[PDB]
Design a protein around this nucleic acid. Structure first.
Ligand SMILES: O=P(O)(O)O[C@H]1[C@H](OP(=O)(O)O)[C@@H](OP(=O)(O)O)[C@H](OP(=O)(O)O)[C@@H](OP(=O)(O)O)[C@H]1OP(=O)(O)O
Length: 56
RNA sequence: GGUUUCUCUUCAGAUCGCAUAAAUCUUUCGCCUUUUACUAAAGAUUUCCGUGGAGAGGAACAACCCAAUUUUUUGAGGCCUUGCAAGGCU
């Protein structure tokens, strides 16, 4: 923002340089995909196989 | 003999990747009723999004000029004495 809004360009809602913000989430998603595949596999296993009686 | 393009196997040393996530455990910290979810540094171990080398199979596109000094175009041949060799010669 401070680099975009310089000179004649004033403060206001028009900056559209979206690569940086987009990039950060993509890296978040790289980490959270394994986690959710494991967690959601447990949710589905508990839904279809049933609750498992002996436990851990 | 080539190039491009898919699948599989194997080995990864290289900033394996001029980029960068998550989880588990152990130490120390911050939160302060308990547990999720957490705060932030160190170390260890995994997962995940990508990469490189090698090999095998399939498919597609192209093709079976120096003879005149310093070297290589000659100072080249002939005589005498001693035990071919040495020397004196022309
Ligand atoms: O200049 P703008 O494009 O209008 O941006 C504004 C403004 O930015 P600046 O004043 O820094 O130029 C706000 O800043 P404050 O007025 O609060 O100081 C900022 O707030 P943040 O600095 O917290 O981002 C606000 O963001 P938001 O609308 O989320 O409050 C943001 O507007 P946008 O970022 O939404 O364009």
């Amino acid at each position: 923002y401070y680099r975009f809004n310089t000179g004649p360009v004033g403060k206001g809602p028009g900056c559209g340089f979206w690569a940086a913000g987009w990039r950060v989430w993509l890296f978040f998603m790289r980490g959270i995909t394994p986690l959710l595949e494991r967690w959601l596999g447990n949710l589905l296993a508990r839904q279809f196989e049933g609750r498992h009686s002996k436990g851990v």
